[PDB]
Amino acid sequence: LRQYNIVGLHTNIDFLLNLSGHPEFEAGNVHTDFIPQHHKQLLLSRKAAAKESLCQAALGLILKEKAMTDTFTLQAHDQFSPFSSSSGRR
Amino acid sequence: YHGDSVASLGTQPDLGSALYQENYKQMKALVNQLHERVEHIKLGGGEKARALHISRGKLLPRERIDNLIDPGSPFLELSQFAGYQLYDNEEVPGGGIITGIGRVSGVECMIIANDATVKGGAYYPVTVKKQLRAQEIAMQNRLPCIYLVDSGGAYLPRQADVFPDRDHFGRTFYNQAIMSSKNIAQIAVVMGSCTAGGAYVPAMADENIIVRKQGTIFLAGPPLVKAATGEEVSAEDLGGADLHCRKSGVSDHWALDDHHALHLTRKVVRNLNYQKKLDVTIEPSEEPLFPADELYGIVGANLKRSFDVREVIARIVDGSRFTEFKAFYGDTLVTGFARIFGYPVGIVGNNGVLFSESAKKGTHFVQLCCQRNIPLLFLQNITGFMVGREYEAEGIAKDGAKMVAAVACAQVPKITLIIGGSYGAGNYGMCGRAYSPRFLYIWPNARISVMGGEQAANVLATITKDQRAREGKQFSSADEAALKEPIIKKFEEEGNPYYSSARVWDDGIIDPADTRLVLGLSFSAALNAPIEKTDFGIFRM
Amino acid sequence: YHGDSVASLGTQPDLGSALYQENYKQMKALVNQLHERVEHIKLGGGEKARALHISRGKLLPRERIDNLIDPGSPFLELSQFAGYQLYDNEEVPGGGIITGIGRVSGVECMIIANDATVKGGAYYPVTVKKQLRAQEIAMQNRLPCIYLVDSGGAYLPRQADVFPDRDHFGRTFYNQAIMSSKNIAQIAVVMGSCTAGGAYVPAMADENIIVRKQGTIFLAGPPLVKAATGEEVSAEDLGGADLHCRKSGVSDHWALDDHHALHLTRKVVRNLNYQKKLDVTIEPSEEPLFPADELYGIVGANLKRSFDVREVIARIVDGSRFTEFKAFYGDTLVTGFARIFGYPVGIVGNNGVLFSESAKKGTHFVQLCCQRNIPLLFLQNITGFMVGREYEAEGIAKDGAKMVAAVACAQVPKITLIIGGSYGAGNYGMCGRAYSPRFLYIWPNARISVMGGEQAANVLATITKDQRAREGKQFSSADEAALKEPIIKKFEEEGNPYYSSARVWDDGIIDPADTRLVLGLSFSAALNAPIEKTDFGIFRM
Ligand SMILES: CC(C)=CC(=O)SCCNC(=O)CCNC(=O)[C@H](O)C(C)(C)COP(=O)(O)OP(=O)(O)OC[C@@H]1O[C@H](n2cnc3c(N)ncnc32)[C@@H](O)[C@@H]1OP(=O)(O)O
Ligand SMILES: CC(C)=CC(=O)SCCNC(=O)CCNC(=O)[C@H](O)C(C)(C)COP(=O)(O)OP(=O)(O)OC[C@@H]1O[C@H](n2cnc3c(N)ncnc32)[C@@H](O)[C@@H]1OP(=O)(O)O
Ligand SMILES: O=CCCCC[C@@H]1SC[C@@H]2NC(=O)N[C@@H]21
Ligand SMILES: O=CCCCC[C@@H]1SC[C@@H]2NC(=O)N[C@@H]21
């Protein structure tokens, strides 16, 4: 389920992951009305992301900008100009 | 077919040698001092001025430049030390203006941004000189100009050095109009109030962007209107983006804030409809075979010692590959062909005193490079120019004149780098400022003067002694000391790289370890314009 | 770097609005009528004429064009309505000739094919005008010409309007020779007998192809030879492909039938040894963000109502991306930069009455576009030109003159599209026919006249009344009605798009939903020729 990812559509992936990760499921005793009692346990708000995740997102944005610069350089004549680099050098 | 194995320059330096240790220590100290001074200059006009500037909701000029250019793109700032201790009691960081070359929407552009935190953006004479130099570079290299205008006009107490002359404030408008006539785009972004003079900059630009309640264009400010005519009016009603866009027609775009103005500027640059075309052969780039920091050990800070320029060449060129031309004739000069970032270059460097053979070899190599349309790179390390009776009988001056004329008449892009001393007519012979190189950089250990201090002192002392003897008057030794010591001190002060960079005598002091990179950028910016044919004068054989 | 997010034009129209429903209904009816008339014109000269033409083993001209151009290639036919009700009792479908731009062997070419089913291919004055317009387009855009010649010479009863003048039949040969001198290929395929005049077309062409027993070249036909000299001879012996190839040397290739002739023409076009080169920046194409049929609702058929031209711009440009220039000054004019199929274009459109500010903005934008070498697209929807005492005091006429001179002196490719009214000097100011646009199309709801019918009637009535009063003669109201009503009726008839397209005043009436596509094709055909520099006259400030 972690390997399976959707982008562009709202899915119940988080609900399935919460159902699988709840220790009652690991216990093996599954009841017909078990989900209604634990409905809001699975449905919880997102947690504040750790600063490492924000750093990874910023790095991804920077690298996407670098890749787009590389594409534009590929379309250009001066392929080896130092300006085409994404060093951010001063 | 480019598969032939070729020998490369460069030798591994002796890292255990005490001379290497001392040279590395001295150069590292110089570079650290340079970096600290650059940081202090970057701090800006002052803390209170920055706080007031932020309180108005405006961006600092360096933030404007960072948000304007393409993300992650390198920025080549020019003349970071303009105005450094130039005036006795006034501090003018960076000359009060920021000029540089960057990449906007994939196009190399010259950005000129006024620093409103330095005397409200008033124009000191050094500011005018820096802006004129940037405009000249843009004209020569055919680069679009972007003026982030936030200025308070000419600095009144120094008006006599700002207003009237040819290379004074009016030359800015002259260059703007001329470059507009040559299909070189001019874009003016009015980020703040322009009291006077600066109001003409958006008017003469091809396209304008003005912030809503920050930028206000008016020929005369409310104080100036009150002083001249006596009419009282507010700044917004006198200028204002709404009042200019709606009925004046001066403004071409209307921006909510600085970010919107920069976005509009990027859109305009994209709509410029320009494409770079290269008229030189290109080869895949390759790194040099030796580290660049070793130059610190190789060069050092003492000019009395001498080093082989081939070390620098091997440390800067691609793959350390160098094809020397006339290696054994005129050994004191090193001329050859190399490549930097794939661009072909003809390197001419000094390795001693200039002789007749060296001048002839330099003239021949310059002729070859001009014929083949190859950019030229000069490396100045001048101990002096050969002088003597037998040399005058052989026309050492006439060979120097040959080299000077050949360098002056050249039309290929020329880039000069002063890695050591630069004295006498040798500076002219190696493409000094007077001979219009596209760029000129110096290392933090250079020295530039008409001659050495002791040589000038001796010349003056001999002149005075001979004149007194002809007159019949005694010339005592105390007079000799009083004539010599001030000359020595003055020549020592005026030769400092920081003294030469406070005035705009170069495009900045560069860390040697960065040299290669800077050159690359410069050469890229030098290749926007097409290379014309070279017409030479009379070669006095 | 072209990754900046940019806002796009366009708004979703209210499909439930009654105004949208009515406008859509009216425009759909107009388009259906246009399509039916085009079908009837395509039917050709007549059933009996087509049967006789087929009985001779020849292909109909449209089949010839279909088999000539590359498979599946689009064909841009010009002036499909020439001669529509132009003559009182004679029906001349398509002017008796078919002119268009197509792709042969990967090269854009101008195909001119005579229709032998219309009066035996005789040349009506409108046919000469259409052929001259096609030749002028080919000359301007540097396109090879292919003449599928099957003609009976000039139409004798109308000879006074065909033979003698400058823009008469001889201009065809003049243009042929001139374009031959400029390395613009001329290929003539003699598909049928040419009585006279048309016999010169293969003679002046660079290369000839003639069918064996269909095509026959002779300066004078057997009837003309009998009338002039009295000699009797058969058509084949007078012309004939064998008799021309073998000893005359007029013919360059010999073809068995029409299919073989078209194959040979394609081979020749391949052997032309030409390659298209683009001198403008190109970006990947992208579809607009809104459907093109919604224009029917947006524009409608009633000219009294007004619409925002930005809707049309968003419906035709790539990705609905538009960079407006001077948005708030002269709001009645919309000027900006966009891209169509990757080609950069400068769009100038009307949004109201032309004021002084609008004229100044248009002049500035035209200057910018000429400086940057960007093709220009004009969208004419003219309610009128602002007049009045205060406007004359401000030189509204002089600002109109500024705009007129700027448009006339322009050298970049110019394409005009009339989406609404076009009256007065505003038509001249927005690149009318007199100012040589590369192409000119109109929508089926346009109206073109010197002014409105009621305005002209009022002007004439006032003139007559003042003259009678000065003379001292009574001017009754019945005289006013008798002067007004015929003028109203005549102005109503002469403003019809079909009236304007019967004469060659444009290059055809186009379905709005096709607009984009047509423009694309036109601009492609406009980019074969290189763009020259623009020289302007005196700008009367
Ligand atoms: C024909 C041509 C080609 C040109 C011309 O005709 S040029 C005509 C004359 N210029 C004007 O008419 C603009 C007059 N400015 C103003 O209308 C405003 O002032 C602004 C717009 C500058 C914003 O001002 P601001 O918000 O930045 O604040 P301010 O404190 O004012 O900023 C620092 C203070 O400015 C003092 N200061 C000294 N010299 C000048 C100077 N030359 N211009 C402005 N200010 C100056 C400084 O000494 C003090 O600080 P200090 O030294 O005491 O610490
Ligand atoms: C210097 C310069 C620059 C130019 C010249 O000098 S130009 C010199 C004069 N031209 C000729 O000398 C060619 C004379 N044609 C012929 O030798 C033939 O006719 C062909 C070759 C045309 C084939 O003819 P075809 O096979 O197509 O049949 P046809 O019935 O004939 O076709 C329709 C009928 O043609 C009548 N018709 C009316 N006007 C003309 C006309 N101008 N030319 C020909 N035919 C005409 C039409 O009225 C009738 O039909 P309709 O109206 O009665 O229904
Ligand atoms: O360059 C310094 C060495 C000592 C002075 C040499 C003099 S400066 C005047 C003349 N011009 C030269 O190039 N060399 C001599
Ligand atoms: O265009 C129609 C509006 C009414 C007439 C306006 C006149 S036509 C003569 C003059 N030239 C213009 O462009 N406008 C006025």
Distance CA C181, CA C186 (A): 10
> Are B366 and B406 within 8 A, CB to CB?
yes
Q: Give C8's DSSP letter.
A: B
Chain B residue numbers touching C355 (CB-CB < 8 A): none
> Are C204 and C180 within 8 A, CB to CB?
yes
C520–chain A nearest CA distance, Å = 23
Is the CB of B486 within 6 Å of ligand 1? no
The values of phi and psi at residue B345, to 5°, are -135, 150
Q: Which ligand is nearest to the CA of C456?
A: 4
Across-strand partners of B350? B333
Helix (H, G, I), strand (E, B) or coil at C388: coil
Q: Give C167's DSSP letter.
A: T
Q: Which ligand is nearest to the CA of C423?
A: 4
What stretch of H or E contains C188?
strand C186-190
Across-strand partners of C101? C76, C110
> Are B292 and B315 within 8 A, CB to CB?
yes
A70–chain B nearest CA distance, Å = 11
Helix (H, G, I), strand (E, B) or coil at B410: coil
The values of phi and psi at residue C100, to 5°, are -165, 170
Distance CA C73, CA C104 (A): 9
Structure tokens given for C439: 């192409």
Q: How was this structure determined?
A: cryo-EM
AA identity, residue B269: V
Pocket test for ligand 2, best of C119, C151, C216, C224 (most atoms within 8 A of CB): C119
Q: Which ligand is nearest to the CA of B388?
A: 3
Q: Which of A62, A63, A66, A80 to mutate to test the interface with B (most CBs of B within 10 A)?
A: A80
Nearest residue of B to residue C326 by CA position? B252
Environment class of residue B229 by beta-carbon count within 10 Å: exposed (0-12), middle (13-18) or buried (19+)?
exposed
Structure tokens given for C178: 């001139």
The rounded Cα B170 to chain-centroid distance in angstroms is 21
Interface of A with C in 69-88 (CB under 8 A): 69, 72
The values of phi and psi at residue C267, to 5°, are -60, -45
Is the CB of B198 within 6 Å of ligand 1? no
Closest CA to B27 of B283, B315, B292: B292
Exposure string for B497-535, b = 16+ CB within 10 A, e = fewer: bebbbbbbbbbbbbbbbebbbbbbbbbbbbbbbebeebe
Partner C contacted by A68 (CB < 8 A):
yes
- Closest ligand 2 atom to Cα of C220: 12
Is the CB of B451 within 6 Å of ligand 3? yes
Is the CB of C46 within 6 Å of ligand 4? no
Chain C residue numbers touching A69 (CB-CB < 8 A): 1
DSSP per-residue letters across C456-507: HHHHHHHHHHHHHHHHT----HHHHHHHHHHHHHHHHHHT-HHHHHHTTSSS
Beta carbons within 8 Å of C202's beta carbon, 6+ residues apart? C149, C188, C190, C194, C208, C210, C217, C250, C251
Interface of B with A in 108-127 (CB under 8 A): 108
Is the CB of C495 within 6 Å of ligand 4? no
Q: Which residues line ligand 2 (CB under 6 A)?
A: C 116, 119-120, 122, 152-156, 169, 193, 195-197, 221, 223-224
> Are C379 and C347 within 8 A, CB to CB?
yes
A51–chain C nearest CA distance, Å = 27
- Which residue has tokens 């008449």? B409
Nearest residue of A to residue B77 by CA position? A90
Asked if the Cβ–Cβ distance from A62 to B520 is below 8 Å, we say no
Closest CA to C189 of C65, C78, C273: C65
Q: Residues of C near B (CB-CB distance < 8 A)? A: 1-2, 4, 6, 280-281, 323, 325-330, 337, 344, 357, 360-361, 368, 371-374
Residue of B74, B106, B277 lying closest to A88 (CB–CB): B74
Resolution in A: 2.7
- Closest ligand 3 atom to Cα of B354: 13
Asked if the Cβ–Cβ distance from A65 to C3 is below 8 Å, we say yes
Asked if the Cβ–Cβ distance from C2 to B70 is below 8 Å, we say no
Distance CA C134, CA B151 (A): 57
Q: Which ligand is nearest to the CA of C156?
A: 2
Residue B518 CB-half CA count within 13 A: 25
> Which residues in C5-117 belong to E strands, given as ranges?
76-78, 97-104, 107-114
Closest CA to C353 of C330, C336, C373, C369: C330
Chain C residue numbers touching B212 (CB-CB < 8 A): none
User: Ligand 4 center to residue C447 CA distance, Å?
Assistant: 14
Chain A residue numbers touching B277 (CB-CB < 8 A): 77
- Which partners does chain C have (≥3 C-beta pairs < 8 Å)? A, B
> Which residue puts its alpha carbon closest to atom 53 of ligand 2?
C119
Residue B474 CB-half CA count within 13 A: 3
Environment class of residue B210 by beta-carbon count within 10 Å: exposed (0-12), middle (13-18) or buried (19+)?
buried
Distance CA B282, CA C240 (A): 60
Nearest residue of C to residue B186 by CA position? C368
Residue of C1, C357, C372 lying closest to B272 (CB–CB): C372
> Which residue puts its alpha carbon closest to atom 51 of ligand 1?
B119
AA identity, residue C466: D
> Which residue puts its alpha carbon closest to atom 30 of ligand 2?
C120
Beta carbons within 8 Å of B286's beta carbon, 6+ residues apart? B318, B319
User: Ligand 4 center to residue C400 CA distance, Å?
Assistant: 11
Closest CA to C62 of C108, C94, C105, C19: C94
Helix (H, G, I), strand (E, B) or coil at B536: coil
Q: Residues of B near C (CB-CB distance < 8 A)? A: 70-71, 73, 103, 105-106, 183, 206-207, 245-249, 251-254, 263, 266-268, 270-275
Across-strand partners of C226? none
